[PDB]
Amino acid sequence: SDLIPAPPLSKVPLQQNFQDNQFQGKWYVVGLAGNAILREDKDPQKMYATIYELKEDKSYNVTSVLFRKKKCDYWIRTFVPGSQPGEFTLGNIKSYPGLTSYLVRVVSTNYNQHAMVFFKAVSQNREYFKITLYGRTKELTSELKENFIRFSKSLGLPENHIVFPVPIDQCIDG
């Protein structure tokens, strides 16, 4: 298994004055880029949603919902606030076989339309990283998508490591 190296954290900006309350709610994964992400023309990635909800202790309950095998899988996890506002770590890391590290960093967002979030996970000693282009609606402007392509490339990812999930109506609505 050969992976493109995770970028130095210096090359990943941080959203200034992060408003955790405003980042709550459903986001659509309109763009996906990473060293473990591949473009598949035979079976193109279907769009999925990720809901963020602040608890009393100000950690997130991050629930992903995707359409797979004719059903709807619910992938739940907790983001604990990290070193800075916008940065998070994965709660209950011990419950994931092999996972020794997990970082999340909100690169940029306007809270009501779009967001770019940088993730980085060390599982089985393999360093994985990804950037998701969150959209409040299923569609986003060409500028925002080209900006996401530009940023992904600045972290060493080529074109075939950047996919744009196709919009669907199954389960990501509601």
Ligand X SMILES: O=C(N[C@H]1COC(=O)[C@@H](NC(=O)c2cccc(O)c2O)COC(=O)[C@@H](NC(=O)c2cccc(O)c2O)COC1=O)c1cccc(O)c1O
Q: Which residues bind ligand X (CB under 6 A)?
A: 34, 36-37, 64, 66, 75, 77, 96, 99, 119-121, 123, 128-130
Which CB atom, from 124 or from 141, has the smaller least distance to ligand X? 124
Which CB atom, from 24 or from 45, has the smaller least distance to ligand X? 45
Closest CA to 153 of 162, 144, 145: 162
DSSP string, 56-84: TTS-EEEEEEEEETTEEEEEEEEEEE-SS
Task: Answer yes or no: are the C-beta atoms of 155 and 148 closer than 8 Å.
Answer: no
Task: Answer yes or no: are the C-beta atoms of 135 and 27 closer than 8 Å.
Answer: yes
- The rounded Cα 104 to chain-centroid distance in angstroms is 8
Task: Answer yes or no: are the C-beta atoms of 40 and 147 closer than 8 Å.
Answer: no
- Alpha-helix residue ranges (DSSP H) falling in the chain: 142-154
Instruction: State in angstroms the smallest separation of the CB of 143 from ligand X.
Output: 26
Which CB atom, from 30 or from 37, has the smaller least distance to ligand X? 37
Instruction: State in angstroms the smallest separation of the CB of 135 from ligand X.
Output: 16
Which CB atom, from 123 or from 170, has the smaller least distance to ligand X? 123
Instruction: State in angstroms the smallest separation of the CB of 57 from ligand X.
Output: 20
Of all residues in the shown chain, the one whose CB is closest to ligand X is 123
Instruction: State in angstroms the smallest separation of the CB of 142 from ligand X.
Output: 25
